[PDB]
C-alpha cells in the first residue's frame, strides 16, 4: 500500500514528483489520479484553514510528540490489560513499518499518524447526532458533550485515529493527576470518542487573541500569523517534522510545504482530502553500496 | 390471431425501420453504429430474459395470472437461440476483426491489445489485471454458455407445455417443470447477473457493481411485466381469454407491475445511495458521468416518470383493474424503461446528452420490433392458455 | 399435499385453537413450566449480564479501536434478522394470496415482535453511553440539536421504530376477532374483560369485515415494503461506510434475503416443536413444511449469489484493499467463520432441493439450526473480519469475543423464549379466524371440484 | 393522505433540521437539495408510519 | 359505503372535540418547546 513513500536524492533534484508520478503509474497507468468526488465539500477560499505537514524525512521516531499529545491533551493511561485487549489512548501514533527486500534486517519506516482533519469526513457523515462535524477553519469537531458511543465513526475512519473511552480510564480519585490535568482541555468520561484535534485549545486562543487584537487596534479583521499557533507536537518535536499553520495563506510554512511535490495524502482514493498531509522521504543513497 | 397478425406486421415495420436507419447510420459512423447495438441488445434482451424468468417464477409459484400469461411467458422466452444470433454483432465488434468492419479501436475496452498488454501504448492496469476474464474468448464462451442454458431451459419448458396440452398427465408434467423451474431461477439468476456484467459493465472495466445484474433483472422484469399487460391488452378479444379470464389475472399483473416499479427504483436507489454516501473515487466516477453534461435531466426524469407517476397512478385499485388503463401506463411505462437503459448504456459513448445520434433510438426500436415480429410468431403457433393445466381452476376465482 | 388436513369444522377449529390458552394455570403443562423456566433462568443472565454492563462499561466486552462494532452488532442484526420471515407471512403471503399463510403467520408475527424487541435493546445496550438514545431521536431540546439524518443510524432509528410500532399494530389488528373469540370462549367473568377491552366488541359483522379485509390488505402493502426498507437500513449501516468489506453495493437485497433465510430457519425450528406438542397436524402440515423448506432454499439460494457477488468483487477488483479482504476470509485468523459459514450456508442446503429431505422433520430441524448457526457466522463475516483488518496495517488487531458478550447472547435467547412463551400461554398460537375462512375456503373449492 | 403527511414530514423535518435551522458541515454532503439522498429512508418510514397508523386507526 | 356513524348528531361535535384537543396540545407544545426557555 502507499502510505511510506520512498524516493531518492538524485531523482528528487531531477524532478521533485516523481515518487507520486511512480506511484501513480503502477496503480492507475496514468501520472496523475482523477479522483472524482460526489460530495462538494465547503469552499476555504477566504478563511483561515488550518492544516498540518509531516515530513517523513525528518522523523526519527522518538514518541516526544505521543507525550506531549499525552500531556496537553489529557489522554488516560490504561492498564497492560486494556492495552492488550486493544483499546491504547493515543492521539497520534508513530508507525513502524519495516519495510524492505529482506524482512531479517529491513529498512525501518516511521511515521506519525494522527487525525488528518479530513475535509469529506467519512467519521463525519456516519455519526447519527453530528457529535463530530467540520468547522468553518476546517476540522474535525470530536464534541465529547455530544459523543453517545455508537463506536461508527472509529469504523468509517480508514485511518483509526479515533480512541474510544471503553471504560473509565480516566483517573478520578488521584488528587496529584486531577492536578497533572490541563484545565483548557475537557477529561473524557467513559463512553464516549477521542482523537487529535489540531490542539484546538491552542487554536481557539490565538483566534480569540487576533480577535481581540483586531478590535482594540479597529481593524474590523482579525490575522492569525504563521506562528501564532504551535501545537503540543509540532512545538515538543525536536526535528521539526511536523509543521502547523495556515492552508490559505501561500506565505506560510505548511502551504510552502505543501506546495512541494513530494507531499502527499494518505489514502487520497477515498475522497477525504486530508489536511495532514506527508512529505514522501527522500533517500540519499551512495553509488559504492546501493547504486 | 386477427390482433397477433397486427403486432407482427406493426413490429415487421418498426424492425425495417430501425435496421434501414441503422444501416444508413453505419455508413457515416460505424463504431456509433455498434454502440448503438449494443443498446439496443441490451434493450431487447429485456423481454425473453424476463419471459424465461417469469416462467419459472409462475411454475414455481401457480397463479391466475400465471396460466394467463404461461403462454405468452413461453413464446418470449423462446426468441433467445435468435437472440444468440443476433449476439454476433456484438462479439465480431469485440473480436480481432473490427478492422474489416469500419470500427477502428474495439468495441470493449478490454479488447485492446495496448490496453491489457505491457508495454503497450495505454496500458491500463486494472483491466491488464482482468485479463483473463474480460477477454473476447472467454467473453464469448460465457455469453453462449448463458444462451445454451437459456435456449435449453426454455424449449424444454415449451415442450413440456405443449406436449401437456396434447397428450399426457397434467399433474405428472407440472411437477417436472416446477422442478426445472426450481434449478432454473437459480441458474438464471447467476446466469443473467454475469450476462449483464459482460455485456453493460465491462464496457468500463474501472468501475463494479454487484447489484448491477440483479438491478438489470429487476428493469427486465418490469419491462416483460408492461410488455404482457399491453399484449394482454391487444388479445383480450380472441375467444379464449373471454371465458377463462376475467379481471383478477389483470389485477395480479398491474399489482406486480406496481411492485416491480417499487423493486426497480429500489435497486436503482440503494446503489445510488451507497455509492453517494461511501464517496470512494473507485464507484463515484459512474454517477459523474451519469450526472454531468445534461444526464442530470435524465435522471430526474427517471426519477419523475419512472417511478413518482407509476408509483401514484398504480396506487389505484381502479387504474389496474382496467386493460386499457394499464396499457397506457403500461407503454408510459416501457418508454420510461427505455429512457433508463438509455441513462444506464448510452453515457458509456456519448458522454453528452445532445451527442445522441438517432442511431441510438433506431437500434432498440428496430430491435425490439424484430423481438415483437418473432414473439407474435411464436404466439400464434400455441394455444393461448394451458388448459390442460392442473392451475386452470385459478381462473375460476 | 393440502395446507388443511380433512375431518375440520369451525367449532372444532375454535375449540381446538382456543383451548391450549384459557385453561387454569392449575392445569398448565410440565412442558410449558421446564421450558419456561429454561427462560427465566437466561432472562436472569440477561438481567445479570445488563447489570453488569451498565456498572462496568461497554469495555467488558471485547471491542477495541479497529473492531468498533462485534457481537452485539452482530447478534443484533441476526435477532433483528429473525423478524423478517414473520413480517414476510404476515404481509407478502396476504399479497400474493398464499394459503399457507392462515395456520402459521400469528405464530411468526409474534416471533417478529419478540425478536425485534430483542434487538432493539442491542442499540441501547452498546451504545455505550445507553441513558442517551433518545439523543439520536429527532426530540426537542434547548441546544437546538438535531441528529444528522445523513448517517444510517438514524435511518435505522425510524426504521426500526416504524418497524416495532407497525408490526405490533398489525399483529394486534390480526388478534382483535382472535380476542373476540377468547372472550366469547373464556368460563371466569374476569377474564372475559380481559379479551373483550382488546377486543373492543368485534361482534364478526360483515360490514365491519369489509373494512378490516381492506386494512388488512393495506397494511400488508405498507408493510412489505417497510420491512424490505428496515433490512435495506440495517444492509445500509455498513453498506454507507468506506470499509472495504462493507462498501458493498448487493447488501440491502442480500441481508433481505439473508433476514428471510434465518427467519424461516427459526420459524421452521418453533413450529415442528408447536406442531408435534399440541394438536396441530392437521392446520401445519407436512406441505406447510415443505413450502417454508422451499421459501428456505431459494432465499438460502440468494445468499449464496450474494457471497459469489462479493467474491466475484474481490477477485475482479484490483483494488489491494478487496483482494485481501478475499485473503483474510479464506486465510486469515478468523477465517473459521468464513470456512464454517460456507459449510453452513452452502453445502446443507444441496439436501434442500431434495424432496424427501425437504418432507424430513429432524433433516429439517438439523439443517434449520446449522442456518442460524452460519447466519451468525455470515454477520461475523461481514462485521469483525472486515473491522479487524482495513486499510493502515498499522491498525489491525483482533477481536477476541469475552464471557459477556456471550452471557448477554444467551440472556437475549431467555428474553424471546420468556415472551414465546407467554405468548403461548396467553394466547393462541395460531389464527383462529382465516383457518376457518381457510376452511371455508376449501370447502368451496371442492364444491367448485 | 397520511402516507402523503408522512412523507411529507418526513422530508420537512430532514431539511429544516439539517439545512435550514442548522447548517452543519459534516462529511462535505451538500447544504441544498442536491442532499436529496440520506432523505429518502426517514422520508419513507415516516410515510409508512402515518399511513399505517391511517390504515389501523381509521379502521377502527 | 356510508361509516357506521354517519348520521349521528354527536360526529361533528366529538370531531371538533378531537381537533381542538389536537391544537390545543400542538400549540401548548409549541409554547414549550420554543416559547419556553
Ligand atoms: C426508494 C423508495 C421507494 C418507495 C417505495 C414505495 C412503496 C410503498 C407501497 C406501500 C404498499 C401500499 C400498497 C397498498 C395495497 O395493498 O394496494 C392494493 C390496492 O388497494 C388500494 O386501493 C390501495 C390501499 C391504499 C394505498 C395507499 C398507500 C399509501 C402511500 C404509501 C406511503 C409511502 C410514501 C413514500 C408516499 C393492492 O396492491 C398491492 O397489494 C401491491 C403491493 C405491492 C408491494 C410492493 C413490494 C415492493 C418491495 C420493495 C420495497 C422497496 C423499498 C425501497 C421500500
Ligand atoms: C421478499 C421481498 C420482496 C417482496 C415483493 C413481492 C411482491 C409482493 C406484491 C406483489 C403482489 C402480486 C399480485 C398478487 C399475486 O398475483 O400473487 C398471488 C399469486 C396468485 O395466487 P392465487 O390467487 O391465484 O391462488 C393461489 C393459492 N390459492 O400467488 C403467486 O403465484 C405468487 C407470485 C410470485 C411473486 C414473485 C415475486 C418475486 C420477487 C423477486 C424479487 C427480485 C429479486 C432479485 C434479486
Ligand atoms: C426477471 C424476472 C424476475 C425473476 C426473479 C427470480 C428470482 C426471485 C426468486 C423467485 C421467487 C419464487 C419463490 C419460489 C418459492 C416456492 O416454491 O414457494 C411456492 C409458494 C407456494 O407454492 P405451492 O403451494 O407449493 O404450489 C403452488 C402450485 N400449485 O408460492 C409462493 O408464492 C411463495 C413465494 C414467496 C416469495 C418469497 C421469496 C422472496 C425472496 C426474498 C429475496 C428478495 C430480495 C429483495
Ligand atoms: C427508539 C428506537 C431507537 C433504537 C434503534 C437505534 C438505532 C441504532 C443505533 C445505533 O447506535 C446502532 C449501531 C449499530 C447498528 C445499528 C444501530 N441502530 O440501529
Ligand atoms: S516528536 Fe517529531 S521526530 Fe519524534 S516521533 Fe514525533 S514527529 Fe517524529
Ligand atoms: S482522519 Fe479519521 S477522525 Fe480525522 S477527519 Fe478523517 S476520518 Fe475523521
Ligand atoms: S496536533 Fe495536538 S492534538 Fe493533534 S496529535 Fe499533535 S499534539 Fe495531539
Ligand atoms: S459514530 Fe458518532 S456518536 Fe460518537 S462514537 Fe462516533 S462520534
Not at chain 2, 498488454?117 to 482482468?130: L, Q, S, V
Not at chain 2, 404482457?228 to 406486480?256: N, Q, T, W
Not at chain 3, 468498533?68 to 407471512?89: E, Q, R, S, Y
Not at chain 5, 349521528?8 to 396540545?25: H, S
Amino acid at each position: 500500500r502507499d502510505i511510506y513513500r520512498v524516493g531518492e536524492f538524485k531523482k528528487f533534484k531531477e524532478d521533485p514528483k516523481y515518487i507520486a508520478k511512480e506511484v501513480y503509474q503502477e496503480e492507475y497507468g496514468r501520472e496523475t489520479p482523477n479522483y472524482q468526488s460526489l460530495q462538494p465539500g465547503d469552499d476555504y477560499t477566504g478563511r483561515n484553514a488550518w492544516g498540518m505537514t509531516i515530513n517523513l524525512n525528518a522523523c526519527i521516531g522518538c514518541n516526544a510528540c505521543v507525550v506531549a499529545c499525552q500531556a496537553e491533551n489529557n489522554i488516560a493511561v490504561v492498564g497492560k490489560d486494556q492495552v492488550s485487549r486493544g483499546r491504547e489512548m493515543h492521539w497520534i501514533r508513530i508507525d513502524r513499518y519495516f519495510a524492505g527486500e529482506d524482512l531479517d534486517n529491513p529498512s525501518i519506516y516511521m511515521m506519525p499518524v494522527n487525525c488528518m482533519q479530513c475535509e469529506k469526513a467519512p467519521c463525519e457523515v456516519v455519526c447519527p447526532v453530528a457529535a463530530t462535524v467540520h468547522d468553518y477553519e476546517g476540522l474535525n469537531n470530536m464534541v465529547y458533550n455530544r459523543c453517545v458511543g455508537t463506536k461508527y465513526c472509529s469504523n468509517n475512519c480508514p485511518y483509526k485515529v479515533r480512541r474510544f473511552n471503553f471504560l473509565q480510564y480516566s483517573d478520578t480519585t488521584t488528587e496529584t493527576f486531577k492536578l497533572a490535568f490541563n484545565p483548557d482541555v475537557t477529561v473524557r468520561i467513559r463512553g464516549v470518542m477521542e482523537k487529535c484535534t489540531y490542539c484546538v485549545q491552542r487554536i481557539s486562543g490565538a483566534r480569540i487573541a487576533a480577535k481581540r487584537a483586531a478590535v482594540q487596534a479597529g481593524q474590523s479583521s482579525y490575522v492569525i500569523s504563521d506562528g501564532a499557533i504551535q501545537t503540543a507536537c509540532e512545538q515538543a518535536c525536536p526535528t521539526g517534522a511536523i509543521v502547523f499553520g495556515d492552508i490559505n495563506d501561500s506565505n506560510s510554512r505548511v502551504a510552502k510545504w505543501k506546495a512541494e511535490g513530494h507531499n502527499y495524502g494518505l489514502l487520497g482514493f477515498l475522497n477525504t482530502v486530508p489536511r495532514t498531509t506527508y512529505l514522501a522521504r527522500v533517500r540519499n543513497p551512495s553509488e559504492e553500496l546501493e547504486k | 390471431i386477427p390482433q397477433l397478425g397486427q403486432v407482427q406486421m406493426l413490429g415487421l415495420a418498426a424492425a425495417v425501420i430501425g435496421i434501414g436507419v441503422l444501416a444508413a447510420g453505419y455508413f457515416l459512423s460505424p463504431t456509433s453504429f455498434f454502440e448503438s447495438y449494443i443498446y439496443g441488445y441490451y434493450v431487447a434482451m429485456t423481454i425473453p430474459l424476463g419471459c424465461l424468468g417469469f416462467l419459472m417464477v409462475q411454475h414455481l409459484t401457480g397463479g391466475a395470472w400465471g396460466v394467463t400469461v404461461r403462454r405468452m411467458l413461453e413464446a418470449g422466452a423462446a426468441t433467445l437461440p435468435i437472440m444468440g444470433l443476433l449476439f454476433i454483432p456484438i462479439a465480431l465488434g469485440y473480436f480481432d476483426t473490427y478492422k474489416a468492419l469500419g470500427l477502428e479501436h474495439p468495441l470493449y475496452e478490454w479488447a485492446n491489445p495496448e490496453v491489457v498488454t505491457p508495454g503497450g501504448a495505454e496500458f491500463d492496469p486494472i483491466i491488464a489485471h482482468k485479463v483473463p476474464w474480460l477477454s473476447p474468448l472467454w467473453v464469448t464462451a460465457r455469453i453462449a454458455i448463458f444462451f445454451i442454458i437459456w435456449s435449453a431451459l426454455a424449449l424444454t419448458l415449451r415442450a413440456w407445455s405443449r406436449q401437456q396440452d396434447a397428450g399426457g398427465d397434467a399433474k405428472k408434467l407440472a411437477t417436472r417443470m416446477r422442478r426445472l423451474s426450481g434449478i432454473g431461477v437459480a441458474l438464471f439468476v447467476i446466469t443473467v447477473t454475469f450476462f449483464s456484467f459482460d455485456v453493460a459493465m465491462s464496457l468500463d472495466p474501472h468501475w463494479f457493481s454487484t447489484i448491477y445484474g440483479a438491478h438489470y433483472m429487476a428493469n427486465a422484469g418490469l419491462m416483460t411485466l408492461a410488455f404482457l399487460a399491453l399484449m394482454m391488452s391487444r388479445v383480450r378479444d380472441a375467444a379464449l381469454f373471454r371465458e377463462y379470464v376475467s379481471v383478477k389475472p389483470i389485477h395480479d399483473i398491474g399489482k406486480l407491475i406496481f411492485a416491480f416499479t417499487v423493486l426497480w427504483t429500489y435497486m436503482s436507489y440503494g446503489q445510488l445511495v451507497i455509492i453517494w454516501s461511501g464517496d470512494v473515487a473507485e464507484f463515484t466516477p459512474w454517477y459523474v458521468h451519469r450526472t454531468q453534461h445534461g444526464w442530470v435531466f435524465v435522471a430526474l426524469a427517471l426519477m419523475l416518470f419512472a417511478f413518482a407517476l407509476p408509483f401514484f397512478v398504480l396506487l389505484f385499485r381502479g387504474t389496474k383493474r382496467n386493460l386499457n388503463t394499464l396499457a397506457t401506463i403500461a407503454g408510459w411505462i416501457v418508454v420510461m424503461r427505455f429512457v433508463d437503459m438509455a441513462w444506464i448504456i448510452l453515457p458509456e459513448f456519448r458522454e453528452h446528452l445532445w451527442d445522441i445520434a438517432i442511431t441510438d433510438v433506431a437500434a432498440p426500436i428496430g430491435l425490439i420490433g424484430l423481438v415483437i415480429a418473432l414473439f407474435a410468431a411464436n404466439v400464434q403457433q400455441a394455444p393461448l392458455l394451458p388448459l390442460r393445466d392442473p392451475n386452470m381452476e385459478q381462473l375460476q376465482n | 399435499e393440502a395446507y388443511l388436513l380433512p375431518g375440520e369444522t369451525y367449532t372444532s377449529i375454535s375449540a381446538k385453537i382456543g383451548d391450549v390458552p384459557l385453561t387454569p394455570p392449575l392445569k398448565t403443562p410440565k412442558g410449558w413450566l421446564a421450558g419456561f423456566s429454561v427462560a427465566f433462568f437466561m432472562l436472569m443472565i440477561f438481567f445479570v449480564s445488563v447489570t453488569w454492563l451498565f456498572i462496568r462499561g461497554v469495555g467488558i466486552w471485547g471491542i477495541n479501536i479497529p473492531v468498533g462494532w462485534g457481537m452485539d452488532i452482530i447478534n443484533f442484526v441476526w435477532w433483528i434478522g429473525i423478524g423478517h420471515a414473520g413480517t414476510l407471512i404476515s404481509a407478502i403471503l396476504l399479497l400474493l394470496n398464499q394459503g399457507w399463510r392462515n395456520s402459521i403467520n400469528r405464530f411468526a408475527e409474534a416471533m417478529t415482535l419478540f425478536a425485534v424487541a430483542c434487538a432493539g435493546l442491542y442499540p441501547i445496550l452498546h451504545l455505550g453511553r445507553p441513558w442517551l438514545f433518545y439523543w439520536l431521536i429527532p426530540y426537542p431540546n434547548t441546544h437546538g440539536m438535531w441528529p444528522q439524518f445523513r448517517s444510517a443510524l438514524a435511518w435505522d432509528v425510524f426504521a426500526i421504530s416504524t418497524y416495532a410500532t407497525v408490526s405490533l399494530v398489525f399483529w394486534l389488528v390480526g388478534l382483535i376477532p382472535d380476542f373476540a373469540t377468547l372472550r366469547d370462549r373464556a368460563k371466569n367473568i374476569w377474564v372475559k374483560r380481559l379479551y373483550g377491552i382488546a377486543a373492543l366488541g368485534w361482534r364478526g359483522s360483515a360490514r365491519h369485515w369489509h373494512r378490516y379485509e381492506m386494512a388488512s390488505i393495506l397494511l400488508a402493502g405498507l408493510s412489505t415494503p417497510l420491512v424490505v426498507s428496515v433490512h435495506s437500513i440495517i444492509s445500509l449501516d455498513f453498506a454507507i461506510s468506506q470499509v472495504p468489506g462493507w462498501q458493498v453495493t448487493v447488501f440491502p437485497p442480500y441481508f433481505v434475503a439473508g433476514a428471510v433465510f434465518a427467519g424461516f430457519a427459526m420459524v421452521l425450528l418453533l413450529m415442528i416443536p408447536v406442531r408435534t406438542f399440541y394438536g396441530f397436524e392437521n392446520y401445519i402440515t407436512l406441505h406447510h413444511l415443505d413450502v417454508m423448506a422451499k421459501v428456505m432454499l431459494t432465499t438460502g439460494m440468494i445468499v449464496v449469489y450474494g457471497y459469489f457477488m462479493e467474491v466475484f468483487a474481490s477477485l475482479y477488483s484490483g483494488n489491494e484493499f478487496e483482494e485481501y479482504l478475499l485473503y483474510n476470509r479464506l486465510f486469515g485468523p478468523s477465517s473459521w467463520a468464513y470456512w464454517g459459514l460456507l459449510f453452513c450456508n452452502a453445502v446443507a442446503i444441496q439436501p434442500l432441493w431434495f424432496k424427501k429431505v425437504r418432507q424430513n422433520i429432524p433433516a429439517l430441524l438439523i439443517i434449520s439450526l446449522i442456518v442460524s448457526v452460519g447466519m451468525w457466522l455470515e454477520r461475523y463475516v461481514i462485521i469483525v473480519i472486515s473491522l479487524e483488518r482495513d486499510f493502515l496495517p498499522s491498525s489491525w488487531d483482533i477481536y477476541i469475543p469475552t464471557i459477556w458478550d456471550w452471557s448477554l447472547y444467551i440472556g437475549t435467547f431467555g428474553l424471546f423464549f420468556t415472551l414465546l412463551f407467554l405468548f403461548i400461554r396467553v394466547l393462541p398460537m395460531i389464527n383462529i379466524f382465516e383457518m376457518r375462512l381457510f376452511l371455508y375456503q376449501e370447502t368451496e373449492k371442492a364444491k367448485q371440484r | 393522505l397520511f402516507g402523503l403527511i408522512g412523507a411529507a414530514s418526513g422530508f420537512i423535518l430532514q431539511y429544516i433540521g439539517n439545512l435550514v435551522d442548522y447548517p452543519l458541515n459534516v462529511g462535505g454532503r451538500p447544504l441544498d437539495i442536491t442532499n436529496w439522498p440520506a432523505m429518502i429512508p426517514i422520508t419513507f418510514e415516516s410515510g409508512i408510519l402515518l399511513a399505517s397508523f391511517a390504515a389501523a386507526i381509521g379502521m377502527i | 359505503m356510508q361509516p357506521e356513524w354517519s348520521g349521528d348528531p354527536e360526529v361533528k361535535p366529538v370531531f371538533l372535540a378531537v381537533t381542538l384537543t389536537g391544537m390545543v396540545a400542538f400549540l401548548l407544545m409549541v409554547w414549550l418547546f420554543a416559547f419556553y426557555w
